């Protein structure tokens, strides 16, 4: 439920929205929040962000060196579980090509969805305060009491005659 500015999954810029409803949006669904929380966590190289030297991933250790596939998978699979709301990891297809020296892995992560605790900070309210009456209706009655009775009588006259 971690709120934050929404990042476009397709381009990487802020998700200002479609041309018909351009604006700014907050990440509300846990899925969207977790997506960007993993994306930033994996995209920032370790130590390259000032104000926090411990954040990021240490790509320099592996890239450019002769490395064992098994060691890399452990670190990749470990960084994911640093988020407190990750249920499990389903599958992991780690493959390496020696000709091009490229490495490419696949996997998915499962996360549940929570409640909103309070709507005070977001948009709307859930209550239905009453509406003041109109004109002399309060002190003298209402005509609808006649209309509903007339309709009931008419429908009952309709019911008895077979159709």
């Amino acid at each position: 439920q971690f709120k934050d500015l929404l990042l476009d999954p397709l381009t990487g810029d802020l998700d200002f929205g479609t041309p018909g409803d351009r604006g700014m949006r907050l990440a509300l669904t846990n899925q969207l929040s977790l997506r960007q929380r993993l994306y930033l966590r994996f995209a920032i190289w370790a130590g390259d962000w000032y104000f926090d030297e411990t954040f990021g991933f240490p790509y320099r250790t592996f890239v450019g060196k002769k490395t064992v596939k098994a060691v890399l998978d452990g670190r990749i699979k470990s960084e994911v579980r640093q988020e407190p709301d990750v249920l499990q990891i389903t599958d992991f297809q780690s493959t390496m090509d020696v000709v091009s020296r490229s490495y490419k892995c696949f996997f998915t992560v499962v996360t549940a969805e929570g409640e909103e605790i309070s709507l005070a900070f977001v948009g709307e309210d859930e209550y239905q305060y009453p509406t003041p009456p109109e004109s002399n209706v309060q002190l003298c009655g209402d005509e609808g009491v006649i209309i509903n009775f007339k309709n009931k009588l008419y429908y009952l006259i309709n019911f008895r005659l077979p159709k």
């Binding site: 002769k66 490395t67 064992v68 098994a70 060691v71």
Partner: protein
């Protein structure tokens, strides 16, 4: 006793004192620089720890 021994006790004190100046000095500078980082490789090596 004789002066010949006084010229000998000094040698016993001088050489012995020189030992601390060697050992005691090396540790002092070894603590005065924190850049160096020691590491030990117990097993591990040939299973991709290279």
């Amino acid at each position: 006793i004789s002066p010949a021994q006084q010229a000998q006790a000094d040698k016993r004190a001088r050489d012995a004192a020189a030992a601390k100046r060697k050992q005691d000095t090396e540790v002092s500078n070894a603590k005065s620089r924190e850049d160096i980082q020691y590491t030990m490789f117990v097993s591990g090596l040939r299973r991709g720890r290279l």
